Amino acid sequence: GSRARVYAEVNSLRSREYWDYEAHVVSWGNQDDYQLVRKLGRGKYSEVFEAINITNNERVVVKILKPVKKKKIKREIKILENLRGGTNIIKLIDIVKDPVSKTPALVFEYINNTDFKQLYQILTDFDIRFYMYELLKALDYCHSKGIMHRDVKPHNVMIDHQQKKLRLIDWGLAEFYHPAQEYNVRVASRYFKGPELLVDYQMYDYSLDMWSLGCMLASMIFRREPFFHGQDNYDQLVRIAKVLGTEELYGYLKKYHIDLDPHFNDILGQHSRKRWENFIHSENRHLVSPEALDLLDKLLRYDHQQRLTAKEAMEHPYFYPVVKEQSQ
Numbered sequence: 082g083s084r085a086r087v088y089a090e091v092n093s094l095r096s097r098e099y100w101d102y103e104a105h106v107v108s109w110g111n112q113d114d115y116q117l118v119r120k121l122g123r124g125k126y127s128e129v130f131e132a133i134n135i136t137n138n139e140r141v142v143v144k145i146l147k148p149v150k151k152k153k154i155k156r157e158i159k160i161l162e163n164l165r166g167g168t169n170i171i172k173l174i175d176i177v178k179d180p181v182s183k184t185p186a187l188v189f190e191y192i193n194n195t196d197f198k199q200l201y202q203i204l205t206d207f208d209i210r211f212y213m214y215e216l217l218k219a220l221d222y223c224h225s226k227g228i229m230h231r232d233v234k235p236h237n238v239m240i241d242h243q244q245k246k247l248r249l250i251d252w253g254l255a256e257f258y259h260p261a262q263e264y265n266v267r268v269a270s271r272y273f274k275g276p277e278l279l280v281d282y283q284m285y286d287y288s289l290d291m292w293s294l295g296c297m298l299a300s301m302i303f304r305r306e307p308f309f310h311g312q313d314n315y316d317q318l319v320r321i322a323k324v325l326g327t328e329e330l331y332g333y334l335k336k337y338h339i340d341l342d343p344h345f346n347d348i349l350g351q352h353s354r355k356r357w358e359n360f361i362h363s364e365n366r367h368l369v370s371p372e373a374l375d376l377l378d379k380l381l382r383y384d385h386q387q388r389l390t391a392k393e394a395m396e397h398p399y400f401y402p403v404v405k406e407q408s409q
């Protein structure tokens with residue numbers, strides 16, 4: 082069966098308490114330190130507020146977890162503990178609960194985010210390299226800690242374009258990687274789902290995050306956001322196959338012995354692999370380079386095992402201007 086090319090054994094080489102999140106004992110702060118100011122949004126199992134820490138006047142974010150899916154809550158809490166101090170990972174400030182109802186909430190640092198719909202249309206070539214490099218730092222960190230994020234997408238990549246600060250947020254779908262474990266494919270947003278998820282291949286790994294990152298890179302350099310805009314999960318794979326090719330898809334399925342849902346037979350058609358240069362036009366030309374296209378081609382590949390790791394991506398020549406500037 083398939084295995085990650087990197088960090089495959091990191092969890093088995095650590096103490097069981099590192100990854101056995103169900104056994105984790107939470108340390109609780111003081112709920113009354115935090116005053117809710119404004120609702121930011123709502124997820125399926127949580128709601129997020131801007132708040133003020135009344136002890137230091139500082140703005141924070143409070144994520145109230147409800148439904149209280151107790152196992153999912155300990156998983157997110159333990160993953161955040163394991164990732165503490167990691168580069169560009171959202172900082173968890175506190176964990177509190179209502180003393181009477183016991184409903185728990187997470188408290189995070191506040192990032193003055195620029196909405197990606199507006200931001201992605203005005204980034205320069207250097208900006209794209211810079212922010213992608215910062216995102217890769219967070220992914221290399223979490224993968225090296227034995228954790229897959231599983232929900233990489235613009236909404237979960239918060240960018241303060243004034244201070245040039247990036248944070249990878251929302252670790253509620255993240256999971257520990259264990260070799261040969263079969264994982265639920267109902268993760269990630271439709272537009273960022275790797276082909277392994279779309280064909281119901283459960284033995285995936287950290288490389289799922291690199292497909293999602295490649296999707297973001299494509300949307301930034303080409304200015305089509307989202308880059309692969311399927312109408313549903315079936316159409317999502319069709320949109321991918323029109324670019325990467327159908328014979329190439331079948332070769333990937335054959336390599337990993339993946340069964341293809343027969344509903345695909347009537348919708349996939351026959352499509353050659355396309356050159357990434359086909360997406361260049363006058364409005365995005367200044368953002369595209371041989372280096373960008375080479376990197377993108379090494380990320381948006383069917384074969385999850387052949388995609389660049391986060392570390393390998395950071396070493397790519399596309400990031401040399403960032404590396405050279407982070408040393409001047």
Ligand SMILES: O=C(O)c1ccc2c(c1)nc(Nc1cccc(Cl)c1)c1ccncc12
Pocket residue numbers: 121122123124128129142144171189190191192193194239250251252
């Ligand atoms: O879940 C986390 O880890 C998490 C952690 C931090 C933030 C967050 C979610 N969501 C934010 N905003 C937001 C905007 C729209 C909808 C929703 Cl649900 C949330 C936000 C804003 C500013 N600073 C930090 C955060």
